[PDB]
Amino acid sequence: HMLLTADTVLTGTELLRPGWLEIASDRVVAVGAGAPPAQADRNLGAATVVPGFVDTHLHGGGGGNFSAATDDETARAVALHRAHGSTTLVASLVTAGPEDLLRQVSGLARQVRAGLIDGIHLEGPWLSTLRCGAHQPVLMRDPDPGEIGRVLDAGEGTVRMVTIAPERDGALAAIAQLVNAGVVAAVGHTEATYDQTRAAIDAGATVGTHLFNAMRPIDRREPGPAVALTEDSRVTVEMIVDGVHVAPAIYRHITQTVGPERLSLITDAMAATGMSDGVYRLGPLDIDVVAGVARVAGTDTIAGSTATMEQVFRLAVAHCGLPRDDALSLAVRQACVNPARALGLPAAGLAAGARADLVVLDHDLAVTAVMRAGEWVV
Amino acid sequence: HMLLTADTVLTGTELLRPGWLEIASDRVVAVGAGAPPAQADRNLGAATVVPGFVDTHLHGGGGGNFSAATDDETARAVALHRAHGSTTLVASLVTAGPEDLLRQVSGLARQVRAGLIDGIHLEGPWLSTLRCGAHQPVLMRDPDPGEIGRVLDAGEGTVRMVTIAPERDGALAAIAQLVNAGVVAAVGHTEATYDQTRAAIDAGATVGTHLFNAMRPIDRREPGPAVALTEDSRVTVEMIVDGVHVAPAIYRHITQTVGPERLSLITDAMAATGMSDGVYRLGPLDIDVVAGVARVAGTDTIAGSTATMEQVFRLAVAHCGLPRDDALSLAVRQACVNPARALGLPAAGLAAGARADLVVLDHDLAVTAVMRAGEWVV
Ligand SMILES: [Zn+2]
Ligand SMILES: [Zn+2]
Ligand SMILES: [Zn+2]
Ligand SMILES: [Zn+2]
């Protein structure tokens, strides 16, 4: 149906130069290096095609908040990230009271079924008040197996990931309850010790919520959660590489520690992504200054990013310390393959049978086109 | 000349079970697996043979202080550690005034030539006063190329390693000066930033002085010296795994990051090693030794260890999280191969032509015999 060629094709596992894809219907039919098996329909130029970006932890964008759980706000959040190459999105909810939580899950679950987003992430309410950040600590509470059951029932299988503070009473049981329901259990926003975090991993936690942020630091006597999470090969750690949340040497250090398959790039994007500076909302209030740097109003407590996956992809390539081609392969694993795997999402690899989600990047790695389900979004 | 057998022989690169070595005079002639090519002279039973331990950073033992620079105190420190398998020793000097420094270097340089010790390590005086520990901060000073030249001349090539605080004025010049003299430049006792430590590494520093101790901690925005040192493959980091200085998960974490060849086990042993408790007055400082645990009398700042390489080898094996055989193989690289390589000392590997330094361990991995220069010390 459509046969595309390009000077660089990243499949998830290989680097094709030049490369070509047969996309036909809604699947990738074939991929290979060299000249295509037939005449091409669209011959791209000096561009790099990568698989669609898979953002597994974001709160909104383009002025829209996923926490609003309305068709209009989700569409405008979805519109921005999709325009920038994020072909899969897991919508994150911050801490909230029991009633609103149920309303938000039900409202978003419809938009998953509708296809705008691919899943729900519960960041809160079961977090630590000492590591709140952009959350309202007063509403945080111990994970109660009754409410957990109600939320997944309300989601009809749409809750994909829940962040848990392993030091709250009943946290290890709640992790077991979540993992038995097929939900990913993540550790974050926690003052848990190394020992308490290691316990959560054995209970079934497999993801680290934005490593080093709202997280006990590494100390020579108390390693904290970050060491437990990077230690265990079952865990995929998140990192915000927007240039603000953690130093590039930290990103480099963790990649060194966990290897190519065990780190997921996320944006933690707030509603200001793609807009201008100004005062915004999340649950409390944010002020956005600098280059879209948001802090909870007058605290220097950083409240998410204003970055897109395109930007974190660019910074990962630039700051990972590898040459460009090796950097592209690493960043594609970290921004596409690994996060979808960690959350049991459809393999982002560009291989025969996979859904045709791909992004076209120019030499400077800016997005020039985006395909999802075999149709051009841009 | 002498043909020894034992059920397990680790050479540095292989695990032989059972194994045999042919020793003639002070060299290893040959090594192999299985039954020996002739009848053995010493048939070791259910023991494990390891290469001699290479302690590249220690301050004394058995009541003796290397800082004393006297035949009697050096003899008693060397005798104890040598009895426990440390067949190669670099004597470390704590911070001291210019006059005292010259006397001590000359005194130790004599004992290098005599064969008691194999080199001198200058830990201080060119360090930061904010991370002194068991040092007298008043005496620390900026590295002056005149005094540095005088110290190496006095040592006649026996000074093997100098710890440098990369944040002191003239630190990057001093590092270049040391490496041009064939001296190892180590980073330690420092508030350097990631950027300042990275500069020192590029200037020729190749060792990190007891990582995480007397060292700026890792922070998400200011990574500090430990990441710079672990990031760069030219650096071998020392670590004290005596159970007191750093948590085993940190040892495990760093090994994960830098790999099997880039960490050196050290003791940092003080004069109370092998003795009883009391107050020991090391480095013109009262040191209270409580239950092996020696800390600067008063504070909770630990002032070195009371461990031997046998003990740090044992704890590394137990806490590295690997299966027994792999733990033995890893620990031998960290306790024998890596430290001798980092300081350009004779390869501790047990291979044809190498000097016959070996250690006999029983089932609990305690030292039962020690060979040096092909002769049994115990
Ligand atoms: Zn968060
Ligand atoms: Zn978040
Ligand atoms: Zn020290
Ligand atoms: Zn020392």
Numbering used by the authors:
A (entry chain B), B (entry chain A): 0 to 377
Show the paper's wording:
NagA enzymes (EC 3.5.1.25) are widespread in nature and found in a range of eukaryotic and prokaryotic species as metal-dependent enzymes with a physiological role in catalyzing the deacetylation of GlcNAc6P to yield GlcN6P and acetate. Our X-ray crystallographic structure determination reveals that MSNagA conforms to the urease structural superfamily, with the same overall fold, domain topology, and architecture as other NagA enzymes whose structures have been determined. Domain I (residues 52–344) is a twisted (β/α)8-TIM barrel that is comprised of eight alternating β-stands and α-helices and encloses the catalytic site of the enzyme and the metal-binding site. Domain II is a small β-barrel comprising eight β-strands contributed from the N and C termini of the MSNagA protein (amino acids 1–51 and 344–382).
The MSNagA protein in the absence of ligand crystallized in space group P1 with four molecules in the asymmetric unit. Although no divalent cations were added during the purification steps, well defined electron density corresponding to two bound metal ions was clearly visible in the cavity of the (α/β) barrel buried at the bottom of the active-site cleft. Each MSNagA monomer in both the ligand-free and ligand-bound models contains two metal ions positioned between 3.1 and 3.4 Å apart from each other. Given that the same protein expressed in M. smegmatis contains predominantly zinc, it was decided to model the metal-binding sites as zinc rather than iron (see “Experimental procedures”). In all chains of the apo-structure, the metal ion that is more buried (M1) makes four interactions coordinated by the side chains His-56, His-58, Glu-122, and Asp-267. The second metal ion (M2) is held in position by the side chains of residues His-188, Glu-122, and His-209. Coordination is completed by water molecules with one water molecule modeled as bridging both of the metals and another bound to M1. In both of the MSNagA crystal structures, the protein forms a homodimer burying a total of 3,200 Å2 of the surface area. The carbonyl group of the GlcNAc6P substrate is positioned ∼2.5 Å from the M1 metal ion, which is ideally primed to stabilize the transition state intermediate formed during catalysis. It is of interest to note, by comparison of the apo- and ligand-bound structures, that there is little conformational change in the binding pocket upon substrate binding to MSNagA.
